[PDB]
Subunit: 158 residues, 2 copies
């Protein structure tokens, strides 16, 4: 279900995750793309100033609610380097956004954390469709698994 | 599990939910209380302006992260008229807030919504601990069930 065009946007997400890591934040990047294929909004994690809710997917949900009609929201796609946490999946569904494509699943992330002896997140790694049963979800992208493993290990595996 | 002091705060949450209803918003109210019993912050639903994520528990999580140290957050309690949705439960856990007490469960509300035929929510009515395993949760408060049913009927009855 991941197309060539989808993978290009996922690579952009990975670049945004890398920007976040390099700035002292956590490696999570996300991009909102409308049905015409225009990038509307890009963001990355910004938790370093002490708000652990500063996730890019959440920013995208609020931005979409403020700037896009319901119909435009439903036809838009959200690309992300890492599958929406429950906070972000719920926000996405509350505002009525459409498709999600992720590079790595929360299952991947949680599995790596336990491999590395790292503490589990404070929030359960629920798949998007546990939280938001109606959302169309594609991913993960096999081509990006190694990159994201390495990027998460840098932040969370030390 | 629910003291008389807890009920006082839950009754304040009901008052805030009614304030929301009367202002054209949905009937959800929430209070943040310091471990020393002082109210720190109170809020209610503000969705009418077009943002379905304007939940008071979420506003509380962000307020807490901005204004309180981690230690003070861990020791604070959040009271709410309606059990946190997954968005809010996750945000509460991310910012490391403490106990939650709710007047009515999301299962209770979901059952009543179905009776009224109403559009089922896009977000699943997961219990807080499915989303946030480590959070201490108490509720519901049987003495406030009928009051809250009536408030919900006012907004969502058909
Ligand atoms: Zn998130
Ligand atoms: Zn909520």
């Amino acid at each position: 279900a991941i197309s060539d065009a989808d993978l290009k946007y996922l690579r952009r997400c990975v670049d945004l995750a890398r920007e976040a890591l390099d700035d002292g934040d956590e490696p999570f990047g996300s991009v909102l793309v409308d049905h015409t294929g225009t990038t509307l909004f890009e963001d990355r994690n910004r938790v370093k100033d002490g708000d652990a809710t500063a996730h890019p997917e959440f920013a995208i949900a609020r931005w979409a609610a403020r700037h896009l009609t319901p119909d435009r929201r439903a036809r838009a796609t959200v690309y992300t380097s890492g599958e929406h946490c429950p906070m972000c999946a719920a926000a996405h569904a509350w505002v009525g956004l459409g498709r999600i494509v992720y590079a790595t699943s929360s299952a991947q992330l949680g599995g790596w954390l336990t491999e590395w002896g790292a503490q589990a997140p404070a929030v359960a790694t629920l798949p998007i469709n546990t939280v938001a049963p109606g959302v169309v979800v594609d991913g993960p992208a096999e081509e990006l698994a190694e990159t994201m493993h390495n990027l998460y290990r840098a932040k969370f595996g030390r």
